[PDB]
Amino acid sequence: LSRRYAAKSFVEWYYRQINENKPVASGYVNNNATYTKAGHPPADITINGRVVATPEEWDTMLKEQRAQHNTSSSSTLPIGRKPVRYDVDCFDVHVINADYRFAAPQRMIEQHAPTDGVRMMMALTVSGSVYFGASPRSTDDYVIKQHFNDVFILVPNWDVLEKGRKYLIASHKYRAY
């Protein structure tokens, strides 16, 4: 399915960035000029029930999470452990609007019909686990394990689709426990 491919590609990118200690801010509408000129509001971001103003702050919170679980200065804890690792279990995607038109160049509207599976606004739900202090590939030797849920609203990246990320985050709700 076209929506599964799009979602799969985003999911793989997004959590790879986090696991490689790289910023995800470039995946949000905030940092796309085409959307910005068209007057799109900043991404709605909620982290464990708290509103976060910018994706850059979310990136900072992820750094802080690593620091919080960085026990490398310990002389007794087992060596070769990674502070934080995100594992995706599965995801679900639902097309909210198959004829999404915000900031769309007119050619893109004409070129892609609502049935072509390109101009989609998608609701993406991701389920997985967060491992703290675990070996790089272990799901058993963690010090702490969380379950997390991510809910994204994705919109088409016109810049890329007419030629980076083919879809951008317009909304993000994160919950981990």
Residue numbers in the entry: 2 to 164, 170 to 183
Sentences from the paper on this structure:
The Mex67–Mtr2 complex (NXF1–NXT1 in metazoans and small bristles in Drosophila melanogastor) is the principal mRNA-export factor in Sacccharomyces cerevisiae. Mex67/NXF1 is a modular protein constructed from four domains: an RNA-recognition motif (RRM) domain, a leucine-rich repeat (LRR) domain, a nuclear transport factor 2-like (NTF2L) domain and an ubiquitin-associated (UBA) domain. Mtr2 is a ∼15–20 kDa protein that also has an NTF2-like fold and forms a tight heterodimeric complex with the Mex67 NTF2L domain.
